[PDB]
Amino acid sequence: PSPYVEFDRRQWRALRMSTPLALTEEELVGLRGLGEQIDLLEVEEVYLPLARLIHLQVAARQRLFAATAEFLGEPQQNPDRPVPFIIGVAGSVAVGKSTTARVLQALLARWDHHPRVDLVTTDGFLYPNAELQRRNLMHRKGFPESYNRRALMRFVTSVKSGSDYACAPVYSHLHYDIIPGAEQVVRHPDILILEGLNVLQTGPTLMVSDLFDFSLYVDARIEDIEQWYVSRFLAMDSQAVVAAREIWRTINRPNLVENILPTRPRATLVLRKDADHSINRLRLRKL
Amino acid sequence: PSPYVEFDRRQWRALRMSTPLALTEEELVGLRGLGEQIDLLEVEEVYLPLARLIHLQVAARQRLFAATAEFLGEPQQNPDRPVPFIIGVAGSVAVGKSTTARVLQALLARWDHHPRVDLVTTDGFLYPNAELQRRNLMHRKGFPESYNRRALMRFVTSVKSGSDYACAPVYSHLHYDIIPGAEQVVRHPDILILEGLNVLQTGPTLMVSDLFDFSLYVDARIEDIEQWYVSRFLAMRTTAAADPESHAHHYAAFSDSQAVVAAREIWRTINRPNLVENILPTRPRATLVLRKDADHSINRLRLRKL
């Protein structure tokens, strides 16, 4: 007996499901609008059903909120609305976290009971390069000590307080650094997806995942991810290949081995991708 | 904005409500069978609506399992029924965890959609005093290292995996030691309540609390818990000296004053630093925090916002 139910892509495809599950134009545009262009078969066969799955939890939580508010008799102290539902997305640099999180962001927004869905990356709570350099941590960028954990906690806490205005700092891929004083403002969305290297990490104290309602870990073979990282580095010369590999071996792989991979059992749902980026195995915690 | 809604006792009582699956006089008085300290007003003002709240989540979880099973189309891999809903209860030695847990256990079992409710204490996963002795941990009894974390984890995991059979060992508060050979068996209940000093503790990678669906922390001023710890140590003495099998224990022959000296000593050196160092910092991880007055009655509820 296992805590998970498993499906390979075959098994998963073989499932006859209710809801017809067809991609809508809004969905496409929604997605293209997030700067993402991923295969449609993947979106159809894997992400639509996943989204429906997740939507059942969100709708269950909204019903519970209202049934609980009814029982309590709709008092003053009780909030008027469910606080945002929070979804964590974890995994290695280059495994597709951001893509996975942007597709769910677009698909989940399609339902009328939860149309406002925000996406925050924890890259934004990285210490700025100067401060990392003040502390001799540039080479450990993305490791747990490279983030301002207190600020991350405060931001997610404020979101789970039902605050109307909660602000995250902004990481620039263009500069590879925090943009000083830029802010992403989150305004009581229905759903918040929080993507990052560290989102399921265990902090002796109180961790940010304590505030999650659902979490995903995006998985793949470590040698496949190394390839994906190299390709991404080449898109941003055998010399570039050499430089990519050095960053992988020195920074990103050890980060994966020591800090990220051990958090995989904590996820609600683990999605494993083969060499071609398509999902070949899903593990869902038993309800 | 806090992540909690907070109510003092006046405000709780001032709330509207419903008194949902409400209790016969006999059913009420039956609850006195959980201990001599059961206060039925407390049970009716606080624990009952609390059980109703919890019952709402247990039932939402049950419908969610069914909606999810239908949507996936009832495949062979999906289980037949929802795995147990697990509730953790945490706090200091002598704050009332066990009583709170026992009351909740009885109230939750009233509902037909979940009548099988088990209660397991993590005291049973302490290493026996002899094993503690081999490990050099007798003076740290109840600290996280005094437990077989791995057997505890395997047991909760097994339950949350929907097994039909899991076993926990058993601690004797009278002989202050594990009972050789004794096991509590747990058989896929609707709800498992897990109670102990370490349940919300934060360890490496995986923690037992990752398997919880809801948790409570029972809270009070430290000064008062001492007083309750001292009182309970007196009562235990008295109880041991009356048992045929337990009057042989050194502590059974303490005088009131000697039992007070020894209780404050254990408090000072063990239970209190355990509380400050390891228990209290888990308080913010609880779904619900119940604070008790000097009189044992609840003066404050903090509930996580849904």
Side-chain angles (χ1 to χ4, degrees), chain B residues 153 155-174:
Chain B
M153 193 71 200
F155 165 82
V156 184
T157 292
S158 171
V159 173
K160 247 305 167 171
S161 301
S163 78
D164 289 309
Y165 187 96
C167 304
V170 186
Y171 189 72
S172 148
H173 295 87
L174 209 47

Tab-separated table of all heavy atoms in Angstrom, chain B residues 153-174, unseen atoms left out:
chain	number	residue	atom	x	y	z
B	153	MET	N	6.636	7.646	11.757
B	153	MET	CA	6.362	8.038	10.367
B	153	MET	C	5.811	6.919	9.563
B	153	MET	O	4.877	7.082	8.783
B	153	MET	CB	7.650	8.555	9.660
B	153	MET	CG	7.355	9.250	8.336
B	153	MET	SD	6.553	10.871	8.620
B	153	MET	CE	5.877	10.990	6.984
B	154	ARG	N	6.396	5.759	9.711
B	154	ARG	CA	5.873	4.582	8.973
B	154	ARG	C	4.407	4.297	9.390
B	154	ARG	O	3.525	4.020	8.576
B	154	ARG	CB	6.821	3.376	9.281
B	155	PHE	N	4.118	4.415	10.694
B	155	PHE	CA	2.723	4.155	11.142
B	155	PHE	C	1.732	5.156	10.519
B	155	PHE	O	0.754	4.754	9.890
B	155	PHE	CB	2.685	4.208	12.651
B	155	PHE	CG	1.315	4.314	13.209
B	155	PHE	CD1	0.514	3.169	13.357
B	155	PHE	CD2	0.819	5.548	13.621
B	155	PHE	CE1	-0.763	3.284	13.876
B	155	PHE	CE2	-0.443	5.651	14.179
B	155	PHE	CZ	-1.230	4.529	14.303
B	156	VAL	N	2.030	6.468	10.582
B	156	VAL	CA	1.058	7.446	10.052
B	156	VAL	C	0.942	7.292	8.545
B	156	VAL	O	-0.145	7.381	7.932
B	156	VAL	CB	1.440	8.870	10.456
B	156	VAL	CG1	0.394	9.828	9.984
B	156	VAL	CG2	1.518	8.980	11.962
B	157	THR	N	2.077	7.015	7.922
B	157	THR	CA	2.101	6.868	6.455
B	157	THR	C	1.213	5.732	6.070
B	157	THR	O	0.315	5.885	5.197
B	157	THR	CB	3.529	6.643	5.965
B	157	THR	OG1	4.236	7.848	6.200
B	157	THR	CG2	3.597	6.387	4.551
B	158	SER	N	1.437	4.598	6.737
B	158	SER	CA	0.633	3.430	6.481
B	158	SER	C	-0.826	3.759	6.635
B	158	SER	O	-1.649	3.408	5.744
B	158	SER	CB	0.979	2.281	7.455
B	158	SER	OG	0.017	1.263	7.284
B	159	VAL	N	-1.195	4.421	7.740
B	159	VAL	CA	-2.642	4.828	7.838
B	159	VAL	C	-3.136	5.705	6.677
B	159	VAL	O	-4.247	5.520	6.127
B	159	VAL	CB	-2.911	5.579	9.129
B	159	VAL	CG1	-4.296	6.114	9.130
B	159	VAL	CG2	-2.715	4.690	10.337
B	160	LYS	N	-2.351	6.738	6.342
B	160	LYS	CA	-2.753	7.650	5.263
B	160	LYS	C	-2.705	6.980	3.928
B	160	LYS	O	-3.233	7.509	2.994
B	160	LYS	CB	-1.800	8.873	5.125
B	160	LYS	CG	-2.363	10.229	5.472
B	160	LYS	CD	-3.619	10.583	4.721
B	160	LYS	CE	-4.252	11.793	5.372
B	160	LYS	NZ	-5.369	12.365	4.604
B	161	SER	N	-1.998	5.863	3.792
B	161	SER	CA	-2.028	5.092	2.531
B	161	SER	C	-3.243	4.217	2.385
B	161	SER	O	-3.467	3.563	1.359
B	161	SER	CB	-0.772	4.249	2.416
B	161	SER	OG	0.391	5.106	2.455
B	162	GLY	N	-4.074	4.220	3.395
B	162	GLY	CA	-5.318	3.502	3.317
B	162	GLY	C	-5.179	2.027	3.654
B	162	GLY	O	-6.082	1.259	3.362
B	163	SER	N	-4.093	1.624	4.296
B	163	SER	CA	-4.024	0.257	4.771
B	163	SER	C	-5.171	-0.078	5.723
B	163	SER	O	-5.816	0.785	6.333
B	163	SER	CB	-2.701	-0.068	5.458
B	163	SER	OG	-2.685	0.463	6.768
B	164	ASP	N	-5.417	-1.368	5.833
B	164	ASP	CA	-6.465	-1.861	6.695
B	164	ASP	C	-5.924	-2.268	8.043
B	164	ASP	O	-6.679	-2.612	8.921
B	164	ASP	CB	-7.215	-2.996	5.998
B	164	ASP	CG	-8.072	-2.489	4.831
B	164	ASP	OD1	-8.884	-1.529	4.998
B	164	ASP	OD2	-7.915	-3.052	3.726
B	165	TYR	N	-4.618	-2.185	8.238
B	165	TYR	CA	-4.026	-2.673	9.478
B	165	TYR	C	-2.720	-1.895	9.760
B	165	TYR	O	-1.785	-2.026	9.035
B	165	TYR	CB	-3.805	-4.226	9.372
B	165	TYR	CG	-3.347	-4.957	10.653
B	165	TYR	CD1	-4.283	-5.588	11.503
B	165	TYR	CD2	-1.987	-5.050	10.993
B	165	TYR	CE1	-3.880	-6.262	12.661
B	165	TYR	CE2	-1.567	-5.717	12.155
B	165	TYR	CZ	-2.522	-6.321	12.996
B	165	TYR	OH	-2.128	-6.989	14.157
B	166	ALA	N	-2.671	-1.076	10.818
B	166	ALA	CA	-1.417	-0.457	11.312
B	166	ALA	C	-1.334	-0.505	12.820
B	166	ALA	O	-2.340	-0.326	13.475
B	166	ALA	CB	-1.355	0.998	10.888
B	167	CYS	N	-0.131	-0.633	13.366
B	167	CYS	CA	0.043	-0.865	14.780
B	167	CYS	C	0.957	0.149	15.365
B	167	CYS	O	1.948	0.467	14.778
B	167	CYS	CB	0.638	-2.292	15.022
B	167	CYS	SG	-0.433	-3.534	14.251
B	168	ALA	N	0.629	0.600	16.566
B	168	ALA	CA	1.424	1.498	17.316
B	168	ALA	C	1.699	0.837	18.671
B	168	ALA	O	0.863	0.125	19.173
B	168	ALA	CB	0.666	2.787	17.515
B	169	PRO	N	2.861	1.078	19.259
B	169	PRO	CA	3.062	0.579	20.612
B	169	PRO	C	2.434	1.463	21.664
B	169	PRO	O	1.835	2.462	21.291
B	169	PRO	CB	4.578	0.564	20.760
B	169	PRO	CG	5.161	1.113	19.471
B	169	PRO	CD	4.046	1.782	18.747
B	170	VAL	N	2.607	1.136	22.968
B	170	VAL	CA	1.765	1.690	23.996
B	170	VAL	C	2.592	2.042	25.179
B	170	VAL	O	3.426	1.289	25.580
B	170	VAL	CB	0.681	0.666	24.378
B	170	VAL	CG1	-0.302	1.274	25.355
B	170	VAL	CG2	-0.104	0.180	23.157
B	171	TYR	N	2.387	3.234	25.689
B	171	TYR	CA	3.089	3.784	26.811
B	171	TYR	C	2.198	3.725	28.065
B	171	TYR	O	1.054	3.945	27.936
B	171	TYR	CB	3.330	5.264	26.569
B	171	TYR	CG	4.253	5.910	27.585
B	171	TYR	CD1	5.631	5.636	27.583
B	171	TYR	CD2	3.777	6.713	28.562
B	171	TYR	CE1	6.489	6.245	28.496
B	171	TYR	CE2	4.620	7.293	29.511
B	171	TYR	CZ	5.992	7.069	29.417
B	171	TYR	OH	6.854	7.647	30.301
B	172	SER	N	2.754	3.465	29.249
B	172	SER	CA	1.995	3.365	30.487
B	172	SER	C	2.397	4.521	31.250
B	172	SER	O	3.530	4.631	31.693
B	172	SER	CB	2.325	2.064	31.300
B	172	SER	OG	2.213	2.296	32.721
B	173	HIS	N	1.482	5.416	31.474
B	173	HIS	CA	1.825	6.574	32.272
B	173	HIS	C	2.065	6.207	33.738
B	173	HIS	O	2.790	6.896	34.444
B	173	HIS	CB	0.723	7.612	32.139
B	173	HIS	CG	0.620	8.147	30.758
B	173	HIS	ND1	-0.140	7.531	29.787
B	173	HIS	CD2	1.268	9.167	30.151
B	173	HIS	CE1	0.025	8.169	28.640
B	173	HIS	NE2	0.865	9.171	28.842
B	174	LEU	N	1.502	5.074	34.170
B	174	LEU	CA	1.605	4.652	35.562
B	174	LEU	C	2.994	4.111	35.855
B	174	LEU	O	3.610	4.473	36.839
B	174	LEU	CB	0.554	3.571	35.833
B	174	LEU	CG	-0.001	3.441	37.255
B	174	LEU	CD1	-0.416	4.742	37.912
B	174	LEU	CD2	-1.195	2.508	37.202
